[PDB]
């Protein structure tokens, strides 16, 4: 009766079902966990918000078209405005979190296409001016739940002030490496003939036990159309991709007044 | 070495000291606690924010003058805009909390005066129009950290629409009972010759295990000048009263989107 | 509903409510649907991003035809009243497309689901009363 | 002849009954019967359905 295709995930007051999954990935074979006393750093008693924040938050959906080049988000950035997770994040200097990432995209037995879904530690991307290096604004690096998109062209700016955004060039993974090698990162593929969802469970990954969430994104989430969407009755059709993410084993230190980042 | 006058209280990242206390009150002899399974009601796993919210928050200070008639606050109303406590309060349908209330008022060995500090369960107060009964607006009932003041005169409104506030008449405790009997409620006195602070530890008190914090205040805090402030070199002098309150054993159920109450 | 009719012979109710949904499109139709229960006291949800902050389930349409969403017992009072009443308000149930329903050609593009309600084993009622659902002339 | 039984609890014991009549139809209400089997209406299926398993396999 039980199947690699059928799964339920419950966190807090939220549950996901899927009937066309393809197993699930646990990044680097490691489930998230709380920070042990023998690896701890800040000494204040941490806040562990548990069910208030460790639950599924669904981002705005994006549309997959035959011309789409792909999508990216950063974490914890994408969830910074999400319920009590966002509040705990911004009221504290330090935070750590794992995640369950659930990417959703259904179609029909007559559609075709394949999405690569990658979780990338320290997903540093190229800037869009050749007058400077590493020249990206905080606002452009941290778009929040809207994330960003890839392009198949690189057109760096004429003036440095106008190029302070990512050059998210698809085939170079926005960072000077070939996209065909992205499979070295934890990943699944949503191949429409096979499955309608991808599930990745991510431990906290960093060179530190805990860090400043408002300064530093630990993971990138990349969705690339490896094989273009095609549907014979209407090649211009669009199907939604929906991203739902739950923080896990969240832990925060260094409580004070709330952080309100710059918006422009 | 140890003394009834000298105390330290630490909750979360916050500590209070006093060197002229007068013991401390534990209301009805009961320390606050979490809600036991055998008395529980809502069935969702609760959020217990612990150190993020169970910590001392200091309200805006008020000035005690020879003409002051007194001050009131409600709880959890007075703390609704306080850090992560306020966030947890408003993101949930249900909440419960105990409190440590620490009232602070120092002067000199040459000043005199006495403040009664009372914690009142279900502190229902009279309205200020005789055209209606129980006719108080949500906004006037819930002033937040600014609280309200008592008056020594009762002047109900000419029109019902203008009297939708409390008639906080001092000698009737704003509710039709004689203020001299307020000592049946948990209390201390700040008598300037003796002490400079009052400390009251309050359990959750209600006819329910847990309730809607945004609808219902469990406690009133009343500060009444029982003996007027006097200072011979300047009878018009003013000394601050500062109220610092820590939620304790906070527990919340029924997570959803954030409650944003009406402001006018 | 059957539950509603029984409740109207009582004054008080308590417990969890079960909402089960049966998708009745064609086998070729796929989709993901969000079903949510938001306990009361905040802005009623009219968008998916508010609804998903409450108790919810994401239903993937497929071979298993039906999905159950629970409104768990989450209340201030130990019983709610079997009347419209602000004090014992129960909150908000909503539903949104999580992705969308997708069909291939030669397939109906509109269809239906059926919603059912029932009480859970934690559910009970008190205080027998006459119903307002039956009457006669005199 | 006297039956002693537990009362339904109130705000904050036992009670005694004696039947006075020769016909059981004369008796007071039947004692509380908490018997139930909702499954005869909620799950009257021939083959057992395990909740955690697929309903259709």
């Amino acid at each position: 009766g039980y199947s690699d295709r059928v799964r339920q995930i419950t966190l807090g007051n939220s549950t996901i079902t899927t009937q066309e999954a393809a197993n699930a990935v646990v990044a680097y074979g490691e489930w998230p966990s709380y920070l042990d006393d023998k690896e701890a750093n800040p000494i204040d008693a941490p806040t562990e918000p548990d069910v208030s924040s460790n639950r599924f938050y669904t981002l705005d959906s994006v549309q997959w078209k035959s011309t789409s080049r792909g999508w990216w988000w950063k974490l914890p950035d994408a969830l910074k405005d999400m319920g009590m997770f966002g509040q705990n994040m911004y009221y504290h200097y330090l935070g750590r979190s794992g995640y369950t990432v659930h990417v959703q995209c259904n179609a029909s037995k007559f559609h075709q296409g394949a999405l690569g879904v990658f979780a990338i530690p320290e997903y540093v991307m190229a800037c869009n001016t050749e007058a400077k290096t590493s020249y990206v604004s905080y606002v452009n690096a941290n778009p929040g739940e809207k994330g960003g998109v890839f392009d198949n062209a690189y057109n760096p700016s004429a003036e440095a002030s106008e190029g302070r955004k990512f050059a998210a060039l698809d085939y170079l993974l926005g960072c000077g490496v070939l996209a065909g090698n992205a499979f070295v990162y934890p990943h699944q593929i949503i191949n429409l003939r096979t499955n309608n969802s991808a599930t990745l469970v991510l431990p906290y990954v960093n060179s530190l036990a805990i860090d400043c969430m408002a300064k530093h994104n630990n993971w990138g989430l990349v969705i690339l159309p490896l094989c273009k969407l095609d549907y014979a009755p209407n090649s211009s059709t669009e199907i939604p991709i929906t991203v739902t993410i739950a923080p896990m084993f969240t832990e925060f230190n260094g409580l004070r007044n709330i952080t309100v980042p710059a918006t422009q | 070495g140890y003394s009834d006058r000298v105390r330290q209280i630490t909750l979360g990242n916050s500590t209070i000291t006093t060197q002229e206390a007068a013991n401390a009150v534990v209301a009805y002899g009961e320390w606050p606690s979490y809600l036991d399974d055998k008395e529980a009601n809502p069935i969702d796993a609760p959020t217990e924010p612990d150190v993020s919210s169970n910590r001392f928050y200091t309200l805006d200070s008020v000035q005690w003058k020879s003409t002051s008639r007194g001050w009131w606050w409600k709880l959890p109303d007075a703390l609704k805009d306080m850090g992560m406590f306020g966030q947890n309060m408003y993101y949930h349908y249900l909440g419960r909390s105990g409190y440590t209330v620490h009232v602070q008022c120092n002067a000199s060995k040459f000043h005199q005066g006495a403040l009664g500090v009372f914690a009142i369960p279900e502190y229902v107060m009279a309205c200020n129009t005789e055209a209606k009964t129980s006719y108080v607006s949500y906004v006037n009932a819930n002033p937040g950290e600014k609280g309200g003041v008592f008056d020594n005169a009762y002047n109900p409104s000419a029109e019902a629409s203008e009297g939708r506030k409390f008639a906080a008449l001092d000698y009737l405790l704003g509710c039709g009972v004689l203020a001299g009997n307020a000592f049946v409620y948990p209390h201390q006195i700040i008598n300037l010759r003796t002490n400079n602070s009052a400390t009251l530890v309050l359990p959750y008190v209600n006819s329910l295990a847990i309730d809607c914090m945004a609808k219902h205040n469990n406690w009133g805090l009343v500060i009444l000048p029982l003996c007027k402030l006097d200072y011979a070199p300047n009878s018009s002098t003013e000394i601050p009263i500062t109220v610092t309150i820590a939620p304790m054993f906070t527990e919340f159920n029924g997570l959803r989107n954030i409650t944003v109450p009406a402001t006018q | 509903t059957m539950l509603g009719e029984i409740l109207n012979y009582y004054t008080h109710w308590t417990g969890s409510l079960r909402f089960t949904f049966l998708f009745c499109g064609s086998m070729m139709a796929t989709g993901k649907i969000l079903l949510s229960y938001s306990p009361p006291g905040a802005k009623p949800p009219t968008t998916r991003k508010d609804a998903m902050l409450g108790t919810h389930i994401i239903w993937d349409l497929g071979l298993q035809s039906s999905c159950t969403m629970l409104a768990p017992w989450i209340s201030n009072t130990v019983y709610r009243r079997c009347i419209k009443d602000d004090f014992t308000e129960g909150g908000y149930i909503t539903c949104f497309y999580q992705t969308r329903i997708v069909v291939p050609s030669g397939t109906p593009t509109s269809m239906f689901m059926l919603a059912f309600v029932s009480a859970c084993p934690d559910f009970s009622v008190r205080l027998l009363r006459d119903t307002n659902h039956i009457s006669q002339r005199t | 002849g006297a039956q002693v039984s537990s009362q339904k609890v109130g705000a904050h014991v036992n009670y005694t009954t004696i039947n006075y009549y020769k016909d059981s139809a004369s008796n007071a209400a039947s004692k509380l019967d908490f018997s139930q089997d909702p499954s005869k209406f909620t799950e009257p299926v021939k083959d057992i359905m395990i909740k955690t398993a697929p309903a259709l396999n």
Binding site: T17 | - | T68, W73 | -
Partner: peptide, 27 residues
């Protein structure tokens, strides 16, 4: 006899899917 108590439970990530069923069965 009482109505049902609620047990302490956390989350799941599992091939057990009690949320789905098929009411065509008559259940």
């Amino acid at each position: 006899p009482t109505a049902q108590s609620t047990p302490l439970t956390s989350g799941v990530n599992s091939q057990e899917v009690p949320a789905l069923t098929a009411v065509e069965t008559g259940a």
